[PDB]
Amino acid sequence: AQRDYELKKAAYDIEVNTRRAQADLAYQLQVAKTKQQIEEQRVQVQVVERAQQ
Amino acid sequence: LDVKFMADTKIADSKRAFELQKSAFSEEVNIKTAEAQLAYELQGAREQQKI
Numbered sequence A: 001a002q003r004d005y006e007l008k009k010a011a012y013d014i015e016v017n018t019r020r021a022q023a024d025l026a027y028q029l030q031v032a033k034t035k036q037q038i039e040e041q042r043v044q045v046q047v048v049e050r051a052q053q
Numbered sequence B: 001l002d003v004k005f006m007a008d009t010k011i012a013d014s015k016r017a018f019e020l021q022k023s024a025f026s027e028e029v030n031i032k033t034a035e036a037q038l039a040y041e042l043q044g045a046r047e048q049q050k051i
Helices: A002-052 B002-050
Strands: none
Touching: A002 B002
16 A cells, blocks of 8 residues: 555655656746846947947 | 474464565665655755756
């Protein structure tokens, strides 16, 4: 009876840990994507600055 | 004493069946325990790829 319960617990824990790992790291991925858009415009100022110089 | 030793044998044969099955069940538990512990890295390393 203990074994029958232990195996389902471990089986469900695989999915819970998997989904938690995804959710945990989901923030930094978007932070990278957002910075990707930002940096393009940060250095775009250099182009405009040089053009007036 | 003759009956004693015979009683001790039947207690041992009962012991035998139990410890044998504990071992079989523990193998299964131990196996899926490792996976439950390490799944965070299997997913973590896989997510660092996109990051």
